Design a protein around this nucleic acid. Sequence first.
DNA 1: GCGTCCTTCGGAAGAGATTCAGA
DNA 2: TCTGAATCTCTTCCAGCACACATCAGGACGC
RNA 3: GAUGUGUGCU
Lengths: 66, 1316, 552
Amino acid sequence: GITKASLATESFISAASFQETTRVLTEAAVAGKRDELRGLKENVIVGRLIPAGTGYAYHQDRMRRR
Amino acid sequence: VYSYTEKKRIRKDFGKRPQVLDVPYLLSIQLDSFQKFIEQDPEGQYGLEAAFRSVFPIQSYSGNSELQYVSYRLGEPVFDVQECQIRGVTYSAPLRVKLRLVIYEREAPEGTVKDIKEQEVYMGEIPLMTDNGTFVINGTERVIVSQLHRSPGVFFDSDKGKTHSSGKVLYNARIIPYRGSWLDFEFDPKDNLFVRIDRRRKLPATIILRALNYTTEQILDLFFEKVIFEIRDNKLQMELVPERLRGETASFDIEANGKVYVEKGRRITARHIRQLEKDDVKLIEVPVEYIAGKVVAKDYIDESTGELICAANMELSLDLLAKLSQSGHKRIETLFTNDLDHGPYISETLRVDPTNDRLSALVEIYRMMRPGEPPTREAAESLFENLFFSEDRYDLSAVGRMKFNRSLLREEIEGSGILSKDDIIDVMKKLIDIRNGKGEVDDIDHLGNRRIRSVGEMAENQFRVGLVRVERAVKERLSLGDLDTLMPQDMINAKPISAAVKEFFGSSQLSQFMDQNNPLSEITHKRRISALGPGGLTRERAGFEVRDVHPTHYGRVCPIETPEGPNIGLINSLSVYAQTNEYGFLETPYRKVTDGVVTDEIHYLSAIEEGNYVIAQANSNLDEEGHFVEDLVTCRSKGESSLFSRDQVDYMDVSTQQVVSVGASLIPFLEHDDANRALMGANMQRQAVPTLRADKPLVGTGMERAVAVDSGVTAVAKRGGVVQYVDASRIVIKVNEDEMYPGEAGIDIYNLTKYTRSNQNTCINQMPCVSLGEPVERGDVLADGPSTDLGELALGQNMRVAFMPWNGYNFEDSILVSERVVQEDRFTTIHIQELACVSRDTKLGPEEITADIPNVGEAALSKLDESGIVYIGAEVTGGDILVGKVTPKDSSLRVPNGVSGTVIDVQVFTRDGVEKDKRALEIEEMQLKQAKKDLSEELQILEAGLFSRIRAVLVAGGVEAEKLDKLPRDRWLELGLTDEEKQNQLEQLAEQYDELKHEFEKKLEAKRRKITQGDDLAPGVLKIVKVYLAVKRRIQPGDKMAGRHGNKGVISKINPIEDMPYDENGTPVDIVLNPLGVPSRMNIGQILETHLGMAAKGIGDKINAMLKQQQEVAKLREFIQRAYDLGADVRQKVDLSTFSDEEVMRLAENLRKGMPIATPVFDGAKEAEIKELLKLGDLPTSGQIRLYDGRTGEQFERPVTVGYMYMLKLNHLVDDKMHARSTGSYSLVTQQPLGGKAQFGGQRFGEMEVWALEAYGAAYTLQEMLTVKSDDVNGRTKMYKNIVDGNHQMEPGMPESFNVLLKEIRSLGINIELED
Amino acid sequence: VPLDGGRFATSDLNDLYRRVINRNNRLKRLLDLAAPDIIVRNEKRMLQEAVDALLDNGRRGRAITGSNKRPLKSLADMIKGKQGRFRQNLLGKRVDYSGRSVITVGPYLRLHQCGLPKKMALELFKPFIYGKLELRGLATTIKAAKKMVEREEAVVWDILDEVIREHPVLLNRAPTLHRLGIQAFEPVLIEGKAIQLHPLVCAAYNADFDGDQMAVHVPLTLEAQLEARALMMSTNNILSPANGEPIIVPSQDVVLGLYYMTRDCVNAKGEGMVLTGPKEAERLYRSGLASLHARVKVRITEYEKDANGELVAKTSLKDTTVGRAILWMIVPKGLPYSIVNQALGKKAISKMLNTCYRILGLKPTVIFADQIMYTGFAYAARSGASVGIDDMVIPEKKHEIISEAEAEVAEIQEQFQSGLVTAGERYNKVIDIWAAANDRVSKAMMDNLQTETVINRDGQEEKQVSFNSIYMMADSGARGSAAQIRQLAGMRGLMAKPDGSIIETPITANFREGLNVLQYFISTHGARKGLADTALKTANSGYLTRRLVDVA
DNA sequence: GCGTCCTTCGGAAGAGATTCAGA
DNA sequence: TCTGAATCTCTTCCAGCACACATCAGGACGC
RNA sequence: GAUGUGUGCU
Ligand SMILES: [Mg+2]
């Protein structure tokens, strides 16, 4: 389901911000996960150009530069 | 006959049915409840006496000394209501109780006593309710809303459906106490009956059975009947009851006396039972295999060795039958276990029962209540005795006991507070009976199970809690005190009672701030029924069924009035005629109907007694004899309506108006509006603001007079008489000689209330509505209050509306308003608001109220005096200085931005120790002079009246009228008169005049003390200056406008006089509404109100025309009589013959503004009457007239509706809502802008807002809205510098709120960090 | 935070840390003094529960409280939940350069224009005023410009009109359900304190003018302004993202005006006359020599673009009205004439705008939408399409239908009391028959209200489509449907309880004639159902869109 | 006026822990 | 007697924005 | 800064 698939997203910050913050944060701390900041909510929380619209070209430049 | 307050402007009424019961006093619940709470009542029935006798007397732990209660008394309040509102202190009275301490002599626990010492000890300080139904707690006025909570008693809930995921209905029994622990019984999916107290955990009820010292013998005998097996030669014949065999299958061949009655496999039909009763047989044969499905009742022991063979409650098999047959147990008793009639739930619970005896059961109960603590037998016994068998820890009220007994079909209605064994046993029997199938559950929305806890009982509970705390304190103190020297105050601490009472009345969920912006709002706020608060449910865990209306709400609770939002249906409003039971239940009046005649005796029927009878409906025609003209009258029998006969009814509704509340009854033509647009209409009638010149509503209801006289703003005349002196600040009556007292009669003076701040910053203002030498009757208005008119609730103005689109300026719901509307000064409203500038003696030195402020020129200090305060009467503008306060190194109070006004009142409060300034002593001297002048004037008035009475007495018994003038007015008491009773009366009046002089001097000295005293303040402030502005809010595009039918809207443009459409007579239209707001929101009643208002204004215009050119009284009287007799069968029946040719000219002058029409709620006008009234004038029957375009000047090519609809003005003013924010203040824990308008805070671009920017893909703007504009610290200033440098560019850093999240996560055991 | 006086704030974390430090220090002191093992064990228990309450309060059996018996928040309640940092201060923040005011109509605007109060713009665009005042040299330093702005000098008002010229702002409503909840408009400085809003986007905003507050926002940086100009502008947002239908649909005044204009009845001041184009039709109607509902044969020049982008001319003589001829004057060059030659309702003009967008483009579509706005408002103001109590006509056969339904439900009474059907089956059939009767009454009233009109064409009487006002505003679709008007005349029908079950007895009366004191009590059930359904079951529909935006 | 201190009451669903049964 | 299916039990969630008012911050006990 | 109550629009 949408809730189940959202809670098991690869970027742990999205799941931590959405629902069951304790149960997701504990899992991410145990597993030693590493977020890539790929989606939209992650870049919203961080405060960058979201890779959605006008910032998509900037995100492409920043990704292909490395 | 009609009084003078009614023969000044008589409202035309369209009521068909007559009213035999007038509306009662509206806010009669609060004053009655508090009277029951405070009145000196013997026998411990009501009030503080009941709580005292339920708590006191106290004796220590064998301390030989008792502190017993005697009586209580309240002293006079320290400050009156005006002083309490001005200062900010509670309007309370000290609580003095004359407690006494008694100790017996040694070696005599019941013999003689040692000594008694008694004094009126001061403990606690309880608030007093004013004469208008509200308290004054901290200067502000609060109203304690009544609570609608679950009645104490026994409740058999169902929990149908959603449990167990199979549809298996459970059954749970609840015993809710008034004060104590819950006793929830419930079943199990495995058909086990588990008790659960205080929602801890489940356990079999047989545990509490053995806790009641019941052996399994007693339980099995109590819950089940017996079937006897007798030892004989063999085959174990069965004792049989004929009725026991109803509706099952014969497992064998049923036979008796040899012959076979029912064949094997055949069911036992009712004829078989009847024939077996006819044959009168009881002993039958049975195979021993049928004994397998039987359980033995009591334990069996051997008669030879004394050893238990089979204990209580176990099955019987062939081996057990063989063992018992050889032993010699002749009588075998077994349980009669059925499958649908009597289930063996008790046996199953005994099977799952963990305990076996009383001691183990008590230890298990102790383990359940307090887990992990080592239990002993004495502690468990004391705990279980305290839970359900003690009046100090558990108490069902009298209403709880009554509900408990009537729910179990008992005859007795009274009883003890605690339960008993039989009560719990009866609850168990009733629950099992419901489980079997006989009877049914009781819903918790049937209003005969929900009480009303009013103000008095809420205060009783809090006072009882404080008394319990003081009880514990004195119990601790009295066991370690030195006797013979302890006065009854050293042990009584006055802190906890007063603290608890103040906490309740000041900070609670039901000590609501009074919604007081107009009389209707306050009078319906006092008549509120809130289901929230302590002891009730919360909006989150509230089922959708509780919101829904129950059929028992009819007459007790308004069905159509409840606030929108989260708390809808939980904040129900009280009906008009609804009352309160002595038990706290709701009941509504009814007229008792005899065999065929409707009697006029009113009976109040509770929510439960209504369903037993059949009740007629109010809109049923009667003909002068209590007879129904129809043979089939509509009625309601049991929560449902069906056609009935005139012979079966025994009750009929008092009036149609009893269904709706007082708030919803003021809407005319309510029976045509949809209730959806009636709820909002009632709310926006509740939220109206008083205008400048209050104006009566044309299409009224006739209840506006009741609301105006009941809400208390109008100065209702206590005693009738003649107005001796009227003034803008006081009214004086020379009362009629019939109602004067023998002594202390004099006259009475009404002190009006001038422009003072209200609880919602509106303007309350009492103004005179009577003239000099006007005879006033008893119980009639004298002073027009806020938004009233001659004792009639006038919440707005009558405006000439027109339903037509106008260039889209009334597009969706907007309202287009003429310039003439504000030219006439109709909707401009006064707004008194206060500004307080405390002077805190904070660190680095105290702060001054000096009149010189550094680095600010004399431009802003011109209005200020040399003292530091602003002059009274200054026309201040936004941003100016009101009081100059500077702290040791500029923090002076200023008028807020964008508000004008005029300072009308400045009050200064100073500490006892900080001396004064010149302005404070100026205000003090002004107050002293005003108080002395007021007292001197009032005593001069009353002594003029007193000597007038003296002179009236002297005229009999040797009078000489000429010498009264030349003899000085001092010695008017010993003048010529003999020694009869008149001389005694004269001496009595001389004595009362001497007492008047004494009270003058003593009360003037007391007022001097009250004004000159310190008036202490909060710790940490030197002096307080309160500035009272006076804002005149004109009408402007942006504020809400709404009629009574829930047709709201916002003014969009103010057109000039000429631009708006005008009829063929050139009269401009004030408001151009939108027609499409009629059909889609089904408030059709606004059209009928518009038509009736048009007819009323046509009649008023004809009266004005006939009065302009002066015609004789005959024509005016004839026309007015034609108008008032136009109704078909109205019960107005006013005759102008009794009018004396002078009091009809006043009526005709008052009708020139428009004839006021009444319209009862569900007995309103019909369109035939409306069209007849239209035809009375010269108006078209269609209701629509012809208007020409204001700008274009050509005909509008359709007739349009024009009339006078009562148009309210809501106090959702746009300048109270207009707001903007540049760079400004910021929060502390997170670097974000503040929230709110008082703080200079910005709007919230919330979680849902960001998706609306990701959706467009506009990433850069989103990045400014949550990185550089709000959150970060360095980029926040960098962007500001860039904006004021000409360079529009953003340099984002990191949001500070993300660093806050990182730090708060690292505060845990989690390590979050940023990579490279 | 130091409050007013000597007391301090009752911050939760400080109390929790105080308790934890108390337990730790007391445990250390007891361990230094060699306390008995049971005492140090109990104190270790106390330390463990104190640390537990500090880390995640409420996860244990009992949540500790400091005052007022209220469960205090730990380090987890401010990271999790609706009030945590993720949903309150990270995914959405309070924003500077913002404002808020009640909105009014002001229908003299255009799609790329809004109306700001003259006082809101001075506080919104304050740094811009500071920058231009420093640029022109009218001020010298920041504080001097601050004082000059606070004194609201005449020069500041002049220069405000310079910054506000082409700097679009973000108009925003409180519930932003979809993408069109934030649209960018250019501001037009006006007096008052109200945010004027263009009604053509009020259907998209769902912003009725009954006292709602919208929020403004100022794009500061260059890219934000260009995004508001090219992406979030209301001119480029005339197609809803939900479907291919346009979102700038005229409604509730313009539809009524157009429908009353584009309509015909057989009589007029001049009926059979012939005109050479729309201009003479306007001349006739303004002078009053021909009614707006005539049936004439004008000579029009409609264009077609059969070529590869070239408009080829054609001129015909079509039999139309005066109103449609007038309306053709604003139709852009390129659409076929067979779009206004009917009774233009709401769906008709929606399809007209859709095909205008599909054929011509964006600029002609927005210009034509503004022209439809103007010509709908003008001829709706001139129409005087009022509403009276003589407009809802009661059909004379509804009581026969309720009598027939009463007879059938009386048959159902005998049907279930005998045993043919049960209680639930009786409840299922009674709603069936009541709904059938309601549907019959609605259709009968609708026919009687739409066809019962008599007019002569200079001879015998002829029937036409009715001119009853309620029929106009129920057929045009400006605001209404079959339900509301059906309940205004004839049968109100049967209402539902908040739980979703339907009442067994439908009230038999209409709002035009009145309601009993008991039928009103029955309709109270439905009235409360609607409100307690909105306010208490839009939560589990906002949750759906929340966890849908989350997953995608 | 200072100053230092040791009640219950929702309900829809998912998941993880028990019990059952059953072959 | 091991091992799936059913049931018991514990936890999570419940629209958005705004406005107004109030209280409240250890309050008990010793000095 | 947080709680409690009331209110507006959805
Ligand atoms: Mg709205």
